[PDB]
Write a protein that binds this ligand. Sequence first.
Ligand SMILES: C[C@H](Cc1ccccc1)[n+]1c/c(=N\C(=O)Nc2cccc(C(F)(F)F)c2)o[nH]1
Length: 167
Amino acid sequence: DMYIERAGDITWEKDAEVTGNSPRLDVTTDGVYRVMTRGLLGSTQVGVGVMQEGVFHTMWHVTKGSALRSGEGRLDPYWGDVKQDLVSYCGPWKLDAAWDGHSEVQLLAVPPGERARNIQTLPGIFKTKDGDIGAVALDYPAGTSGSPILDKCGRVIGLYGNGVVIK
Ligand SMILES: C[C@H](Cc1ccccc1)[n+]1c/c(=N\C(=O)Nc2cccc(C(F)(F)F)c2)o[nH]1
């Protein structure tokens, strides 16, 4: 039994936390949800995801294509990609926004057993083997993966877990 419970609103918080890990630039209803999996003993958060325009968005490794219970209703997967590590439920992919490249972002981190929180940060670019990946330099536990990363205009520009390749 894999299910979703709501974590909070998707907003750019003006008085958000600011990380010391990076340098500064200059001196059905929508929201974030915890993807859970109940067991014999207790319950355990496997990931995070975004509900937007009647479509639930998360990463493939969280659910692995499993149907999600949502209180009374049930959510079947519509589309996915294993190599990109993405999956949508109830409709096609709707998060069309992207990082501009010259701005700070807010990670709306939704960690396991802990409240949702915005952390402001400048993304770095890391030359990995087989790509220059852009990433937010913030280590959160596994189960936080799928947490949305936001721009100043409120839009989800990426999901936390794996970085983003640049070509
Ligand atoms: C700290 C750790 C570092 C790490 C990175 C990759 C592999 C292994 C380790 N890390 C980063 C992370 N996620 C993102 O940075 N995601 C993201 C997605 C789209 C867009 C943006 C952008 F807006 F910053 F560019 C970021 O998850 N973990």
